[model samples]
Target: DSVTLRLMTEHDLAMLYEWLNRSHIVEWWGGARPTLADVQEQYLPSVLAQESVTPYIAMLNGEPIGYAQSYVALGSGDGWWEEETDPGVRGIDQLLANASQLGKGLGTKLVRALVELLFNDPEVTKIQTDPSPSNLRAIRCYEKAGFERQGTVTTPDGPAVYMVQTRQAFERTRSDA
Candidate 1:
């Protein structure tokens, strides 16, 4: 009942470094290992102010438990979501900070909370995520959270299982719940 999303701050950058470098996080997060400086340089701008994307720390009973971020896929640039043209389409990335929290339904709860927050903005029409296809745990978590598979796609992060949750679907699920 205490699950909540807090906007990440410059203060949380240190925690992000810790989470990003952890073995479990690195296994699925991809890319070269980021140094503390890299984390600051990459995240500080967003933390200070960013309109296209927002970062969050997932909290449980007032304690930080994980990290999540949502972004407008249309203008994300880079090699990400290049095929997406709808400005209302958003994307997400996340990880549970502690391996011990795995298998406890926390990931699903965290994602569902994040989805609810994003969809609070009526301009948002959908949310998408691309997890490594082999990451069965993450795939299952997303499924349980109401994301439908859109099949595998090649992202800048390489091959991933693309999944999505539309506003209509989210609304329907919330009503049922």
Candidate 2:
């Protein structure tokens, strides 16, 4: 049950596009169906070209099961919070693309792996995520990964609950666990 992260490549575009267009994924993420060409011609290239963000495919026992990404919050200009007075915070976003993988603890593992990756950069003092309030499952997953509720706020995407974990907090939890 070892989970590994691999950098996403053009070879992964088709499956990624399919996963993104799935009805369950659309219901959770709120996006319209997109063609494989759309992913290759626009989305994938644009996202991957960004130096600030790094996307990875989550593989378990040699099978791709999910997607995860992390980026420098200020550099990415996501403006995830109005009260982000603390500098050097990284923004993390991830999803288990396959619905079957849900509720299997994979999400927590993926998030913890991403957080550990972020901490590798000493400048990253905190990790942040904005999950929709309706997505209690995601909130709980994040909490289990050591994030603390920072409060809620409205985003262009809609109202979301913001959560964060300091490097110190994550390290303490890791040690305790």
Candidate 3:
């Protein structure tokens, strides 16, 4: 029941291409299903050289199960998190690849794993995610992983439920665990 994440690479694009089109992934990840070429074009820069975003692949028992990405909230541009001035604040996004595995709690584990990874950096003070307000399942999953809801906000993708977990809270949670 352990989840681990590693930096995603260009070699993983084909896998990502298929996952992006899955009905369950599309439901939560939003946007139209991207073609393989689109996936390559959109992800290559980040996977190869972008510093604004860092992409990761979640694995369970040696098998890749999902995708995640984190980016500095401030100066994210593209109409995202402009109000966030704290450079320590980072944003995350994730999705489980297999629809059949939904509700098995792997999503929460994936999120927590990513949270821990980000918080490992001493400069990271907070981590946030904006799941669609209607995504009850994702909201619950994030809560289980220690994120607190801070209400809703508008993003390029539309309205989202802004949730965040601070470094203080993460440390407190870990100390007692």
Candidate 4:
């Protein structure tokens, strides 16, 4: 089955808030339980600001089932990924919101689709994600999408295992798939 990545908008905020409040999602995403007001005030506004970061909603057959984000890291000047010397890299974050879809390979499909989407930009050479080292499920999903773990890095939130997928690698994987 094919999935799609759509730019997130105000209409999806309520669903996003509930997804964030889920214990499984909050564990790594918010680092704490988030309230609806907190979500509206902090989350969507940052996404709408479009300051290098862009959020997304993943849909399968017209049903929104996950939340994702991709951000340009070149000049954002965020110290966390400063070690990532590649100026053409884009950072990504995401999770399945529908509990029923967990462990169903949806994550791999979602990441693969997002990888193709980002690679559409001629300037984007690489894409990356920082997942807690303990999040084995996520690490595996990324690996399936052709990302290679580049080991650990400290972020504003904390330490995370940095996984990266180069355009060339994804292209090969996409062709093979």
- Give the best candidate by TM-score: 3
Clashes of each: 0, 0, 0, 0
Candidate with better TM-score, 1 vs 4: 1
TM-score of each: 0.93, 0.88, 0.94, 0.91
Cα lDDT, all candidates: 0.86, 0.80, 0.89, 0.83
* Per-residue lDDT of candidate 1, residues 51-123 (tens digit): 4678889999888999988888887757878788799998888899998988999999999899899899999
* lDDT per residue (tens digit) for residues 7-59 in model 4: 88877888899999887787767766777887776658464455577889999
Candidate 3: deviation at residue 158, Å? 1.1
lDDT of 1 at 66: 93
2 against 4, candidate with superior TM-score: 4
TM-score of 3: 0.94
**RMSD value for candidate 2:** 2.3
lDDT of 4: 0.83
Clashing pairs in 4: none
lDDT of 4 at 56: 91
Candidate 2: worst-modelled 10 consecutive residues by lDDT: 75-84
